[PDB]
Design a protein around this ligand. Structure first.
Ligand code: FAD
Ligand code: FAD
Ligand code: ZMI
Ligand code: ZMI
Ligand code: ZMI
Lengths: 588, 588
């Protein structure tokens, strides 16, 4: 056990020092490497459980059992006297820089996971390159460094959500005594987009600064893995070349799908285009029913838009369907129109986008309802939100041997390793994993530490909490009620639930019984909490802390013995008592 | 053990049925009791692990070991045949109403704890009275049923906090694209007070409806305990009479203190007066530095007021002082003035309150700083927030034998029992307990179940989370950093911390490094989280869920392995890494 860990650690680390905190010979070597600007990992043996056993295993590489011992890319370099000899003789810089490869690590993809992995690897002395290229959308939209979340995802969508939430803050202000008249106030799309894009631009620049300050080589080029250690790159001038690397991390993400119907690619847009659109969309149709579809329809309606959503079957497939129906009912009562049980057949152009006067075009959408009736209506903008997919045929030569599943995602071990031993995959392209930004970041950072600092901790992908940022937000952690019932049986499941009303909604005359929460519990396991669900304001802030308790195995008794904070929405979880089986009403 | 539990349960319950879920004779007795509208507790012996032992112990009370067995106020009434006999002979109603006392329970005080205890007791058949009287403030202010939180505490203060938060929402809305101009909008104090008071009145009415629907006797009268079982009551016509009860719960709360200086009682006010004041306070001095003082100063400033706070020594004594100083620095940067190291000597009247034109008066405040320099300034309103105190000499004859501590609070066992065996105390008057509304509710409900339904569960008063609703909110759960170091020593304490910026503050151009969080941990106990602290928006929603994890013994490793929800403020707790001992900056 200990011998196999040490072997893997030594073969993989770029530069690593084995040390003890109390040793002045170790401190002497540490200070030399700091002066020479040589970054490295450090393993303090006096702070590990079996440090004595490791110290004896080191002799199988160095034939000494003392400390310090310095290694570079699998090779024992020397003890204190030897390292100072290389330093005194101006031979140290050359020894720590010799490698079979151009880089210790090449990351293909500069998004949530890839930037996290590359920066963390560099901190331990791995010579690292990060490659990023943004293929333009069909209408030509492109953006800077940082990935989907930063540029066309979590960041701009939550900022536009906040712009929509402020519409209701303006209405509430009158009831709390402020003198404004909400009915005389309007919204300016282009002013909002300019502020959002200025923030995104500051993130693009901050990531380039961060890579420079960690000595990471940033290449704005398209990468393609042609053999296990060779990456072909093509730059903005179509100059083609090859770089080599010891370890490879694939982190290229996904892009939006289009349906295979006439006019979709030519005349519609996706979320990739929405967040920098230079004109207000006008009367809008959203095709789809994912969290992306509902989040976008929701803020467009709150900004004052005329918005319709076309739903093939159900809302939020894969989420708790009682919660999903309450989400949609709120949206329908607050100005979002729905075309239910309906699909599109073709998009026809009636007017071209007026790019000079900054106005949308006009489109005729034809489709049909599931019974057989026809749909036909005119819209200024049509947004497709019908799923996302990777396109690893762009990234990955089939001769390399990296196995993909039937959806085109990478099949990985529980430590992110592919079927090719030096190649790993993280983020949205790792098959079977939750497709979320904090998951990609944790996977990338934890992987970098295992490769270059001898860490052993794995990423835990179970019970990862989520929040859907619809007009009324929906947070969740764990199983839906229907998945719990299918797994364990109805007689082994107890559900505690309640409506609630935020105190802030009282003076503002908002609804009494629309916010809702529940705990789905397993009777035969001490009433273990299998899933937590909340519909209400600030749902992400409410849910996050409970994710720690669920990770730890919280029971209903743990929620009961914990005391609430008053007045809050979250405290309602500490006093739940009405069960679904009792038939008693959950209203306030 | 079991036999001591059974004797206490039988002696104390008003009406109780010993039963098994599987027994049709028990079902027949349940159905008769429901038809006669006789409320009662039930214990299902087949749901307890020592149910066989309990069934044998019942025989020393009834001389039988079968189920069902019905008891009334410590007396065995009968089995199935006997209960049915009393019913068909119209004898049962008189039997179940036989009592040595007028009531099974008298609650003195109709606030957070007292209303909770009284309603819960009545559910198990306890004949219950709740007494409530509101002694007017020095200027004559009074209010309805529900206690301090409902009328002059948590509820109106958080509603006025929300009105203040909406000021910054109006400012933010411009940056997100909305057409309003914040500089032309003003606030109307009387409109806000009218809305707050209409909500408080709906709560007053709802509590009277709830007591009527639970068959609880509500007496709007002042109560005084004159012997262990006798309560003297004085009504609004000054009629004096005596009622008797088996169990007594003291739940009379506290009221604000005034300093002993000339003019304080005559010309100043307290929080009791603020929340229904018919005119805007105008230019205001708040004397004190408690959470009540800073919350009130904070929202008055956000509503456009000229506000000063006079601080004797420090802010928020008893809270973590690094967090208290950050709370005050934010207020001072956003328009609250502070007179530090200063106390008042006298209040002089310059103008009487203008009741006709609905305007405040004018006052001259004289004081001095700790070095002896003088303070002298004019204000329209002076609010004293210098602590709260019970006044149990008004509630409790000294000859009854209930022991008080040096501060005048009631000394209780861990099951809320006083030194008089049938008398219990809950809420703010229970010595040594956190003075919070959800604590009083849990204590009252749990106590009623122990008295009248044979329950055993105690209230857990440890690590109860809190939130201070200052303009930037401060949430906490567990020990302050200085208390942790005093208890375990500095070398056994590690502190992880970080600044953060809410995403909502980016486009709004608010501050980069004002929000802050830390985890105070114990090294020698697996890095156990001893205390959690957060300064930021929605801090009560952030903190609540983590209180369950801390109750369960969370360590830093539990926070690390839990994944964040993005984009949120709370997710910053899941990736903390900078220690105070490293000296590395917490800025982001
Ligand atoms: C509209 C929307 C909203 C979302 N909201 C949230 C939210 O609120 N919370 C949340 O947790 N998640 C959210 N997500 C999900 C989140 O955006 C993703 O889970 C995350 O971005 C995945 O990170 P990644 O590192 O796997 O890939 P990405 O961030 O997509 O980065 C991959 C990068 O690699 C580049 N690349 C691709 N091929 C190559 C190549 N051959 N050579 C070089 N570079 C290449 C891509 O152009 C891209 O820049 C949202 C997603 C969308 C679409
Ligand atoms: C300004 C302010 C803000 C607060 N904010 C919060 C907050 O945000 N969160 C929180 O958790 N806590 C808050 N608190 C504390 C909370 O109000 C108290 O902890 C809670 O009200 C205590 O409940 P209680 O049942 O002990 O007493 P109370 O609610 O004070 O009820 C006691 C009642 O008994 C009556 N009474 C007294 N003597 C007699 C008698 N002889 N006969 C009959 N009736 C009598 C009193 O008039 C009163 O109606 C706040 C307090 C204040 C002052
Ligand atoms: C807001 C949001 C995003 C997701 C998500 O990313 N993926 N779902 C998923 C879950 C578990 C395993 C595998 C998966 F693919 N869920 O909610
Ligand atoms: C020391 C003390 C005695 C009383 C007194 O008489 N209270 N009775 C009363 C009850 C209800 C409304 C109005 C009332 F006056 N108050 O304080
Ligand atoms: C054991 C213990 C805790 C306390 C106490 O400080 N209670 N009150 C309080 C605290 C924090 C915020 C708001 C509050 F009202 N007294 O004794």
């Amino acid at each position: 056990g200990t011998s196999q860990w040490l072997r893997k650690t030594v073969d993989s680390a770029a530069v690593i020092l084995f040390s003890k905190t109390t040793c002045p010979y170790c401190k002497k070597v540490k200070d030399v490497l700091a002066e020479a600007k040589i970054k490295h990992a450090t393993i303090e043996l006096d702070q590990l459980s079996n440090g004595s056993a490791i110290q004896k295993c080191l002799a199988s590489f160095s034939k000494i059992e003392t400390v310090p011992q310095m290694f570079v890319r699998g090779k024992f370099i020397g003890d204190s006297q030897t390292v100072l000899k290389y330093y005194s003789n101006d031979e140290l810089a050359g020894i720590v820089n010799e490698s079979k490869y151009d880089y210790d690590l090449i990351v293909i993809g500069g998004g949530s996971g890839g930037l996290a992995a590359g920066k963390e690897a560099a901190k331990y002395g791995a010579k690292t390159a990060v490659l990023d290229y943004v293929e333009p959308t069909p209408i030509g939209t492109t953006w800077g460094l940082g990935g989907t979340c930063v540029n066309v995802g979590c960041i701009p969508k939550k900022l536009m959500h906040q712009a929509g939430l402020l519409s209701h803050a303006l209405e509430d202000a009158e009831h709390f005594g402020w003198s404004l008249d909400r009915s005389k106030i309007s919204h300016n799309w282009s002013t909002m987009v300019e502020g959002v894009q200025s923030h995104i631009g500051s993130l693009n620049w901050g990531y380039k600064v961060a890579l420079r300050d960690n000595q990471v080589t940033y290449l704005n080029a398209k990468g393609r893995l042609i053999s296990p250690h060779e990456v072909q790159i093509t730059d903005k001038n179509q100059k083609v070349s090859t770089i080599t690397g010891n370890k490879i991390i694939l982190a290229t993400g996904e892009r939006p799908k289009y349906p295979e119907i006439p006019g979709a690619v030519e005349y519609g847009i996706t979320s990739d285009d929405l967040f920098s659109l230079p004109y207000f969309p006008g009367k809008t149709l959203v095709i789809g029913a994912s969290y992306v579809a509902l989040e976008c329809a929701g803020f467009l309606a709150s900004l004052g838009g005329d918005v319709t959503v076309m739903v093939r079957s159900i809302l939020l497939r894969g989420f708790d369907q009682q919660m999903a129906e309450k989400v949609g009912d709120y949206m329908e009562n607050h100005g979002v129109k729905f075309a239910k049980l309906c699909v599109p057949d073709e998009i026809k152009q009636l007017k071209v986008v007026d790019t000079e006067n900054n106005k949308p075009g006009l489109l005729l959408v034809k489709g049909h309802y599931t019974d057989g009736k026809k749909f036909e209506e005119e819209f200024e903008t049509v947004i497709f939100a019908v799923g996302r997919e990777p396109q690893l045929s762009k990234v990955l030569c089939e001769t390399v041997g990296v196995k993909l599943d039937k959806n085109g995602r990478v099949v990985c071990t529980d430590d992110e390793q592919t079927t090719v031993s030096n190649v790993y995959a993280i983020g949205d392209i790792n098959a079977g994993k939750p497709q979320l930004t904090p998951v990609a970041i944790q996977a990338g950072r934890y992987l970098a530490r295992r490769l270059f600092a001898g860490a052993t901790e794995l990423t835990d992908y179970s019970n990862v909490a989520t929040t859907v940022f619809t007009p009324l937000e929906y947070g969740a952690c764990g199983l839906s009620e229907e998945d719990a019932i299918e797994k364990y049986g109805d007689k082994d499941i107890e559900v505690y639930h309640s409506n609630f009303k935020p105190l802030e909604w009282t003076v503002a005359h908002r609804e009494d019984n629309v916010c809702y929460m529940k705990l789905v519990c397993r009777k035969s396991d001490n009433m273990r909490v299998l899933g937590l669900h909340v519909l209400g304001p600030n749902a992400g802030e409410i849910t996050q802390g409970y994710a720690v308790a669920i990770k730890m195995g919280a029971t209903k008794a743990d929620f009961d013995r914990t005391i609430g904070i008053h007045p809050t929405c979250s405290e309602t979880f500490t006093t739940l008592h009405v069960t679904k089986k009792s038939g008693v009403s959950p209203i306030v």
